[PDB]
Design an enzyme around this catalytic site. Sequence first.
Site, mmCIF file in Angstrom:
data_model
loop_
_atom_site.group_PDB
_atom_site.id
_atom_site.type_symbol
_atom_site.label_atom_id
_atom_site.label_comp_id
_atom_site.label_asym_id
_atom_site.label_seq_id
_atom_site.Cartn_x
_atom_site.Cartn_y
_atom_site.Cartn_z
ATOM 1 N N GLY A 11 -68.116 59.757 -45.504
ATOM 2 C CA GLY A 11 -67.619 58.575 -45.990
ATOM 3 C C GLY A 11 -66.488 58.108 -45.120
ATOM 4 O O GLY A 11 -66.020 58.554 -44.295
ATOM 5 N N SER A 13 -62.986 57.123 -43.826
ATOM 6 C CA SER A 13 -61.888 57.736 -43.755
ATOM 7 C C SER A 13 -62.080 59.315 -44.469
ATOM 8 O O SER A 13 -60.928 59.993 -44.682
ATOM 9 C CB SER A 13 -60.942 57.126 -45.167
ATOM 10 O OG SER A 13 -60.365 56.035 -44.618
ATOM 11 N N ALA A 14 -63.204 59.846 -43.946
ATOM 12 C CA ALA A 14 -63.256 61.303 -44.506
ATOM 13 C C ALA A 14 -62.893 62.215 -43.170
ATOM 14 O O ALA A 14 -62.546 63.200 -43.223
ATOM 15 C CB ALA A 14 -64.861 61.511 -44.500
ATOM 16 N N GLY A 15 -62.506 61.287 -42.172
ATOM 17 C CA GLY A 15 -61.955 61.996 -40.854
ATOM 18 C C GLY A 15 -62.653 62.419 -39.700
ATOM 19 O O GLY A 15 -62.419 62.822 -39.017
ATOM 20 N N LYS A 16 -63.948 61.653 -39.820
ATOM 21 C CA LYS A 16 -65.048 61.682 -38.932
ATOM 22 C C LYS A 16 -64.408 61.556 -37.481
ATOM 23 O O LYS A 16 -64.720 62.330 -36.578
ATOM 24 C CB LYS A 16 -66.156 60.638 -39.101
ATOM 25 C CG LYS A 16 -66.933 61.109 -40.364
ATOM 26 C CD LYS A 16 -68.133 60.223 -40.262
ATOM 27 C CE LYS A 16 -68.211 58.658 -40.889
ATOM 28 N NZ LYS A 16 -67.282 58.541 -41.676
ATOM 29 N N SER A 17 -63.780 60.398 -37.059
ATOM 30 C CA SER A 17 -63.283 59.781 -35.562
ATOM 31 C C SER A 17 -62.332 61.054 -35.352
ATOM 32 O O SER A 17 -62.452 61.498 -34.267
ATOM 33 C CB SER A 17 -62.619 58.587 -35.838
ATOM 34 O OG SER A 17 -63.732 57.781 -36.104
ATOM 35 N N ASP A 37 -68.901 52.762 -35.641
ATOM 36 C CA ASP A 37 -67.785 51.635 -35.350
ATOM 37 C C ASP A 37 -68.153 51.151 -34.156
ATOM 38 O O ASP A 37 -68.211 50.076 -33.756
ATOM 39 C CB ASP A 37 -66.639 52.570 -35.331
ATOM 40 C CG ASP A 37 -66.275 52.959 -36.885
ATOM 41 O OD1 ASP A 37 -66.246 52.124 -37.785
ATOM 42 O OD2 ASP A 37 -65.709 54.036 -36.739
#
Lengths: 178, 178, 178, 178
Positions: A11, A13-17, A37
């Site tokens: 989701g 803001s889960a911290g993917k980036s 993105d």
Amino acid sequence: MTTRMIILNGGSSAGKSGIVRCLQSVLPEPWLAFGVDSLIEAMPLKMQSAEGGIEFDADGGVSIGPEFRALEGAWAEGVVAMARAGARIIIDDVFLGGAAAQERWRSFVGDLDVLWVGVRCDGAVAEGRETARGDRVAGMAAKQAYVVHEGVEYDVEVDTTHKESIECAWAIAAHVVP
Amino acid sequence: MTTRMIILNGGSSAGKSGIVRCLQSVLPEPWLAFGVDSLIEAMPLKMQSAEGGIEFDADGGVSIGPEFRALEGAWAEGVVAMARAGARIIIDDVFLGGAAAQERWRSFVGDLDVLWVGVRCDGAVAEGRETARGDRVAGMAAKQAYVVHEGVEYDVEVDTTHKESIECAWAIAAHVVP
Amino acid sequence: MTTRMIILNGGSSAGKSGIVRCLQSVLPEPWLAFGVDSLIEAMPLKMQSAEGGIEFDADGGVSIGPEFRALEGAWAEGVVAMARAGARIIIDDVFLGGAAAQERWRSFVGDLDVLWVGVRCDGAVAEGRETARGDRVAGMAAKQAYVVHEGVEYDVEVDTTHKESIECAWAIAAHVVP
Amino acid sequence: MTTRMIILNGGSSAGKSGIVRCLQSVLPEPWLAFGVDSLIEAMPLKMQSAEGGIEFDADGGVSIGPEFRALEGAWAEGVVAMARAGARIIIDDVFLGGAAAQERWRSFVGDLDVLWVGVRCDGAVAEGRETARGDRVAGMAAKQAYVVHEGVEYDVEVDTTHKESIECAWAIAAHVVP
């Protein structure tokens, strides 16, 4: 044998980036990174204001029209092709359609060796980070925190609720076959 | 009585910015935010390539010349003036000079009601976040994690090693006197 | 028949990006945009600090190692594949190697219908714009203003020295076959 | 005698920022730059979604509530104070209220030596640049191109319709008294 593409799902803001940048730093071989993105970035601005494209309602809800779908499909075949050509590819996405989204990726990936990663994070925490980051449209984090994983199969799962990005990256790299 | 200015001090990647955005969201009254980053932003580009300005070595070390100091001093009087004029001001900074830096701020602040905040975070963790964020020059987080707090007095201390930004923000807001 | 990919070549600050955004706005069908910039973006940060990657000297000079080349090659096949899959693709690049660079693209493009665009701009003017934009490393505009076009064949040429981006975009769109 | 503050007024996309960066580069002494943009940046995100703050309608129209006004007033006194403290200040703004806006600035500036600059650009051209830049909300350039200058007095006027930023900067610097 060798992992050709790493696909992270989580989701907003889960911290993917952050995990992706960590992976790029940690992994010895150069990994190219692409995600929803950068895809939005590559689409014409007017695509965020259309029918068959993408729109965000007031509460963070997101909807994808056919115009968007068509482009995304082609973009998918492209990155897959990049991998097929020998470039290690990292992709982070948000499976709004849950399992269906995974199937879509499966159709494009074919027999390509892929490492499927799940990036979880509690909704309330994600929401907080969404605020901290300063994201334009608030509400996405909470709305996407759980549904995007429904029916989705992963080779590895990380939860950023209590683990730093670098740590999650270490866990993921461990499963990357050179 | 009423808190006029909130000043956060912490090493690079300690989470200052995120906490600030959270504070802006949490606090009922509108708080203007300014920090060393926006200051650098306002300085001419050539200031990052000069003597009396600011330069970053290879390992993340930072040095500030007199040209920079002069501007920063004036900028300080400005934000203080903003507060004096009735605008609630939030400022995040990196006290490279430890206590000395606090004294400098003390000289500009005068009898203005200020809430001094300390933002801590373990060096190794900060370093990881530095990588996750994708900061140009790696090394700052570790180098600044502890020295910036030496001899510095705080009204409130938060540690982002195991606390989310929003949570730290809540702790800080609790000490803000309307 | 139908134009599948538009490839713009021009020195840094020649106005490539602006023209691209204008094209995306002007063209009726959705065109995905990708360029050397987004490519750098997708590469790991450490790639800007390596051998076989990319480095910028003090005066704006640029050099590309084999590591970079390998990735770029795969990235090229990818966007070409995107086009082959039905997505209209716009690509802006900086042919440091002049004609050689065009040949490289020619090898990847194959029989794909491509519209080759040349984006010129006087060196001194480009340099000025480089300053106006606030680009980190000054010097690129002047260094690349002319060499990148040596021996390069174009289907259309625009010069932003005295023409606005939107105008150049109009000229280019005129040559796009639906 | 000595110019303490330079204030540029112009419609969105008139080229204010580019000229400012050019000025910072051209001027021998270090000039700090601040503008309505960095002000918005410093305001809490929620300020773009409020009453007494700032909102942008569909066609690029802009409205400023009292909450915004209050903050801006304090911010104004701050930069003026920065100048009063010896820092050379450059400010770019968009006088939506025309002459009234100038009067507002006049009230804050007092007897401070200020160089009033007018930055013009044809509406249609500005609009094109607005598209080229990729600004979120289209329509501002055209709407602000002329009204912002109504009744406004300038010490110097530049028109970016046919002049590069660097050139306009040269014209402006010429009027800066050391």
